[PDB]
């Protein structure tokens, strides 16, 4: 028959004697002792430990822990052969075990901007005791700031208490990214046993920030004809997110072929260098946008206008255009003017121009040898001149006039150009 | 002096005559014609196109487009040498160009759950005309559903109109992930010219969904001693997100060494196979959780309890334990019982047990040769027997009793065990 006895009781505690009937202990050997003539049965210097017994290991909750034993009634005035009695001692549980977390530091990663109400599981504490003497409650201990951000809930759904962090306010990683709470587990023994763990919440990053350029808009001056590799400007943007969410790539946004041909933009450095032949005479300003884009899964981006002013070099010689006026008309660079026409009548029209700018296009223009023609301003960097006679002409020694015009810049080095006009005359009586 | 003339006017339009004073056209050659004796000046079969002229290419807004020309006054009763007049014709702009998007399909990616108010840039339309005859307005045309989700704003900040989509309601990719709007660009000419583009918004995924198991909880039966590779159960979770945000990895959540040793869980298939020697006698149930975790940047997850019931095989032979009772006591497997002791006095206590379950542990037990001992039930799968004498004993032909006990299962195949006891007697007068 049965016997209810608390575990871990001190040696020689009476567990009972026979409500039935030499009494000898055949089975139960380390844990029990019997006395003969009485049938009374006590604990020993090996204590019955409800969590220690082999028999009571993987038991489902509510199944008693039963230690089995046999004693043999072996006297009846030395008459009978023995009768044995197969007893059962049901070991009662005392609260001799503390509830424990697997690790004393517990580490939760909660994303930024997680919706209020969101639940996150906390590792279960466990307790080797049974029923009421096992896990009873979880308690969240937090600083004022954190008290308002994190709650604690327990789900009794699994029929085993699963504790959960509730997020209750907005988390922002860029404001604050680590919270220290304590989680305390207590059992339902009297007195209770209790255990604590450090519960860190780390706020995981989300890509909730776009790059921003250091300046809204960028300018730079760049010399025409700069060598390949010449540094033009460096753009830079910043991003307040973490890792790849703040890693940035620079690419041309709106940028026509003409610009892409001349300028190279490094994805990583945002440094713009020369890559082709810059020519103020083809393009005097490079206008384009740069795109700064993060390496988030759904990248965010920003755009910046850049204006590169192209600066003049004196790389163009002046042009001398020699054409007719009124009735006097050139053919294949020669002109028919008849002997005996008024002094300072105009034989040709001379236009002078320079494709460069400022000084580099400021042109002086003048006539070569000893020939009886000069230039008169007719109308800077485009000058129009009458090419007119200095003297009267007779067919004396003439039809041999090659007039040679020379023009020069104010560049450095200065550039020169020359063009000529043949005038054939006609004799008059 | 100047002259204001609209572009693309029909040949022979009068652009004026001399408020000043043979008149001859020296410069301006394809586009203008003059008549002599009058000084009156008209357009030709080559039309002045304000967007076509070389002179008027990369002009900043508000700088007139000036076509330059020269005519020479070359008669004064055939007295003077010629005077030239360097004229300027300022070409007025008409609205002869339509505003255009670079592509007629424009493609915006807006993330799911983007905060209401968020702005997203729409590519600029451009228009080769000038001032009021260029881009005036942008218009967003959308279906009822979309009208409420997307607004349109223009920023006049850059001093060039930058249009922007405003998100005005929640987008959910899992509800709907493609919207067709039309964007219409109109200029400020009378009549206006206008152009449209298809503006697709595609709603980009965010990892806003956690995996869910097909079942909350899983059971399976598994035979003890199953071969390596035997399929146990397959767990499966689903995730309503896109690509990696719904790609799932299965790993043990809470799972003790003992289980991890026996069971293998494929990260990709969620199939659990046998990997070690399952032994109902060591562990009769495998209890563990499985974690399903997505491959999002900040993974979300779900847990499922699994219970594997381990099923018995008859892989254990019965045990025969032979021990003393009362005063009769065994030493080194032999026992001292004296000749002349009552018929059916008990020489030993025989306990029989089988580590298996049900039939596989149901034990029949019996005595071997012709020896004057039998077994009596003393007290299934643990049976206790008195080993008692059948006859009286005299030292006639004795001290030579080797009693052999045999026990068998009800398994398949059945298993057998044997143990023996020597009894030495003592002669009495
Ligand atoms: Ca204990
Ligand atoms: Ca406890
Ligand atoms: Ca206990
Ligand atoms: Ca943030
Ligand atoms: Ca921190
Ligand atoms: Ca970012
Ligand atoms: Ca962030
Ligand atoms: Ca040049
Ligand atoms: Ca020059
Ligand atoms: Ca130059
Ligand atoms: Ca002559
Ligand atoms: Ca036009
Ligand atoms: Ca227009
Ligand atoms: Ca126009
Ligand atoms: Ca969604
Ligand atoms: Ca779609
Ligand atoms: Ca997901
Ligand atoms: Ca989603
Ligand atoms: Ca086994
Ligand atoms: Ca068996
Ligand atoms: Ca078995
Ligand atoms: Ca005898």
Residue numbers in the entry:
A (entry chain A), B (entry chain A): 3 to 23, 32 to 389, 394 to 443
Provide the publication's sentences verbatim.
Protocadherin-1 (PCDH1) is a non-clustered δ1 protocadherin involved in respiratory diseases. PCDH1 may bind bronchial epithelial cells and epithelial cells of the airway mucosa together by mediating homophilic adhesion and helping in forming the epithelial barrier. Here we use bead aggregation assays to show that repeats EC1 to EC4 form the minimal adhesive unit for human (Homo sapiens [hs]) PCDH1, despite its longer extracellular domain with seven EC repeats.
The first two, PCDH1 EC3-4bc at 3.05 Å and PCDH1 EC1-4bc at 2.85 Å, were obtained using bacterially produced protein. There are three calcium ions in each complete linker region (EC1–EC2, EC2–EC3, and EC3–EC4) and one calcium ion at the end of EC4. An additional calcium ion near the EC2–EC3 linker is unique, it is at a crystal contact, and it might be present due to purification and crystallization conditions with high calcium. Analyses of the interaction interfaces with the Protein, Interfaces, Surfaces and Assemblies (PISA)48 server revealed large interface areas of 1539 Å2 for PCDH1-I1 (385 Å2 per repeat; 486 Å2 for EC1:EC4 and EC4:EC1, 231 Å2 for EC2:EC3 and EC3:EC2) and 1270 Å2 for PCDH1-I2 (423 Å2 per repeat; 461 Å2 for EC2:EC4 and EC4:EC2, 190 Å2 for EC3:EC3) respectively. Both interface areas are greater than 856 Å2, an empirical cut-off to distinguish biological interfaces from crystal contacts. Altogether, these data indicate that the PCDH1-I1 interface mediates trans homodimerization in solution (independently of possible cis dimer conformations induced by C-terminal EC repeats or the Fc tag) and that it is responsible for bead aggregation in vitro.
